[PDB]
Design a protein around this ligand. Structure first.
Ligand SMILES: Nc1nc2c(ncn2[C@@H]2O[C@H](COP(=O)(O)OP(=O)(O)O)[C@@H](O)[C@H]2O)c(=O)[nH]1
Length: 378
């Protein structure tokens, strides 16, 4: 019943809440070391470098919470010109959000809390209309926005990118790569009335090196075309599987023979879009639909968990470090303060420093709790 994308959205709210308290806490502590340092009748209870540190952490942490809020999961599709890239995309969003046929630039599909479908382009924030400007409009990206109220995936922080045929483009496999580098999952949409090409395999060889251990799915689309032929279907499947397994397991070495059974699917996007646009059959239609729904399930488990790790961990780590250093600073103020009536200013200094350090520990415990739920194995 429960979309595994929920995992990413929950992680996102935790780390955003934690960083909200971190900025609050470090602002509080920054005023304290400032007060202590600037107090004329104190010798060197808090130093100027104590203060430059805190202010630095202060300036950092605001913009950190400013980024994770915009953090989303990204899936990018590749394949030859009529393999069914946009159809797979439209099948996952239960609607014809993108049109088949052609263009030659990337198309992302985002969510809007807003209610009308629309389209933006590069360096212009004017909201052009969804599908009339579709035909018309060193890479090139146009961004489609569809109402989050019409698709769970877009509600749940997923962005889906369409790429131009890998057939028809070289200038290399490079601006493609710096459109992709954000991406948590790469889907190869292959035409199953055909055979896995080397122009498609080479692009993924590029991604394989430039990025460490990418998640890749192979969708053998158009599996209609091979329908009704139950034993012919079994033997064609075997050959596609043998070529796909080889690529993932022995060529890209990106996965082992077993988990690769969870990366290769035989699917008919057209059929799925139909039965889904339908909520107002050839042989094996339901079987096909179930395999597509298995892929979606497995894909969501994979992208949710992966994107939590590669988009939130290093901020978690960095926050632990910030908290560590600020404990050191509280520790040293408390210590310098232990070495008339000045005495009761220092003891009050000492009490507030301990207050602060125990706040640091409290926040440290939450970070550690976050890492337990969301970052195995802590
Ligand atoms: N028969 C059949 N046609 C399909 C299937 N998937 C896509 N198509 C058709 O193939 C053509 C090109 O598909 P499209 O989704 O635009 O592929 P793309 O251009 O690579 O994004 C369109 O006419 C689609 O309706 C399928 O599973 N079966």
């Amino acid at each position: 019943p429960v979309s595994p994308l929920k995992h990413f959205v929950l992680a996102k709210k935790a780390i955003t809440a934690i960083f909200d308290q971190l900025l609050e806490f470090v602002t509080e502590g920054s005023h304290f070391v400032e007060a202590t340092y600037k107090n004329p009748e104190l010798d060197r209870i808090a130093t100027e470098d104590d203060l430059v540190e805190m202010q630095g952490y202060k300036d950092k942490l605001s913009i950190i919470g400013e980024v994770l809020s915009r953090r989303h999961m990204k899936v990018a599709f590749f394949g030859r010109t009529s393999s069914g890239k946009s159809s797979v995309i439209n099948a996952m969003l239960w609607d014809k959000v993108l049109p088949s046929g052609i263009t030659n630039c990337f198309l992302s599909v985002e969510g809007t809390d807003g209610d009308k479908a629309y389209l933006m382009t590069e360096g212009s924030d004017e909201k052009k209309s969804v599908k009339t400007v579709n035909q018309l409009a060193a890479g090139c990206l146009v961004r489609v926005f569809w109402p989050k109220a019409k698709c769970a995936l877009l509600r749940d922080d997923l962005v889906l990118v369409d790429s131009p045929g890998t057939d028809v483009t070289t200038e290399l496999d490079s601006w493609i790569d710096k459109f992709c580098l954000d991406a948590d999952v790469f889907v190869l949409v292959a035409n199953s009335e055909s055979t896995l090409m080397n122009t498609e395999k080479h692009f993924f060889h590029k991604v394989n090196e430039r990025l460490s251990k990418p998640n890749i799915f192979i969708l053998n689309n158009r599996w209609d075309a091979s329908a009704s032929e139950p034993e012919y279907m079994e033997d064609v499947r075997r050959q596609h599987m043998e070529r796909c397994l080889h690529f993932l397991v022995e060529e890209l070495k990106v996965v082992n023979a077993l988990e690769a059974q969870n990366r290769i699917f035989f699917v008919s996007a057209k059929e799925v879009l139909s039965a889904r646009k339908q909520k107002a059959l050839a042989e094996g239609f339901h079987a096909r639909l179930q395999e597509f729904q298995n892929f979606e399930q497995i894909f969501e488990e994979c992208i949710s968990q992966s994107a939590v790790k590669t988009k939130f961990e290093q901020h978690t780590i960095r926050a632990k470090q910030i908290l560590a250093t600020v404990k050191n600073i509280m520790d040293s103020v408390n210590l310098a303060a232990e070495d008339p009536k000045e005495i009761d200013q220092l003891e009050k200094i000492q009490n507030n420093s301990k207050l602060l350090r125990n706040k640091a520990v409290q926040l440290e415990n939450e970070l550690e709790n976050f890492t337990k739920q969301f970052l195995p194995s802590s």
